[model samples]
Target: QDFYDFKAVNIRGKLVSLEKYRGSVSLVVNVASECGFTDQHYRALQQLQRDLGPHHFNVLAFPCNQFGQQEPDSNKEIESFARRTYSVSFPMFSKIAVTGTGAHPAFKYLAQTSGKEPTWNFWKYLVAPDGKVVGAWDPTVSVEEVRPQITALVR
Candidate 1:
């Protein structure tokens, strides 16, 4: 995939193609609203955007409920929660399964090509501008781990 070949329903239940973000670095994250790691990742996302998203980099947030059903809200409700809680301004696609046979195709391709699957929510794959896998950071990878790569990419 030369672009972010993902198709996720938006908050309105409308399917959205990821190709719209072809020029930006897509940090495809499978997120859970209440995971212990959620807060840190969201903050890092905000910081990354503050430092890089303004320059066409983004944290492509994809909510998933498979992990403990952490996200049980409807799309609208989830969007509202994300806005109020995380101040998620980059982009938040509708909820989808991020693992197993029922996993989203985007995630399937990511795991196959990148060899990094979401063992749990908050797992992230850093995709380059050309759609190739750049890196896969586990849930434990910190906000500090993001800055160097972000700066290098933007430069």
Candidate 2:
């Protein structure tokens, strides 16, 4: 199954189908507001969205509180925090668990396909335009480090 087979609630509480991103290269990430990686990841993710987004590419951010409770705010609060603090313009989803039994189905699919489940906040999964899970990286990997692969797919 591909990424579009899943559905999730957006930060605004709207149930959004992944199908809307069907033909775009997407960087799906588990994000947190209070994590040490928060500042850098949010900044770079926004940069990526600005550089190649709303068309060929998009950054799909999912807030998760399971990692040290780093994303403890409500969905609205989380959305406001990211938008206000980081100037995040890409899509942001509601808070959800990213690991273990309680994980969201979309995340489960990501882990099952890429063999990489997030160990901390900011873990990323890159999806191709055709909805294939092309790459996965942990929080330690910088967004810039994966730019070439994303740019290649977008082009």
Candidate 3:
């Protein structure tokens, strides 16, 4: 599926239109609660969302259970955990399989664009303001490196 043609459920169980991010720079990340890198990625994502949101930047987080069953909570429960622990304010999405045949269409499209299928949790796809996925990074890529690329797109 194309980026604008994709749709996903929010933590509230509402269908979200991916078209909203068309003119904005977005980081579409596959996340999991119990992963070793979860905490830091949440913190960094929250920071990026807050710091760059005014410039039309967003961090769209998608929880996935495909990896080691790391994200086992329901959407509501996962929503609460993120807000309570990380104070996350960016949009939290419903849990979905982000790999293999069962992967969500958006994730599948992202993998096709980046030539990667999230090997683990917290894989990020950096979408430019023009809606093209300009970069893809794994968990180990520092948020500092990501910050510059995101800002550069909208600045």
Q: In lDDT terms, which candidate is top?
A: 2
- TM-score, every prediction: 0.91, 0.97, 0.95
RMSD (CA, angstroms), candidate 3: 1.2
**Over the stretch 22-122, how does candidate 1's per-residue lDDT look in tens digits?**
76777888777788887778877777777787777888888899887888878888788778987878788888887899888888888889877888878
Which structure is stronger by TM-score: 2 or 3?
A: 2
User: Which pairs, if any, clash in model 1?
Assistant: none
Model 1 TM-score, all chains together? 0.91
Q: TM-score: which is higher, 1 or 2?
A: 2
Give lDDT: candidate 2, residue 57: 93
Error of 1 at 83 (Å): 0.5
lDDT of 3: 0.87
CA RMSD of all predictions: 1.5, 1.0, 1.2
| Candidate 3 least-lDDT 10 residues | 1-10
lDDT (CA) per prediction? 0.79, 0.90, 0.87
Give Cα distance to truth, residue 150, candidate 3, Å: 0.7
Off by over 4 Å in 1: none
lDDT of 2 by residue, 24-82 (tens): 89999999999998898899999999998845899999999898999988999998899
Candidate 3 displacement at residue 67 in angstroms = 1.3
| Candidate 2 global Cα RMSD | 1.0
- Error of model 3, residue 83, in angstroms: 1.0
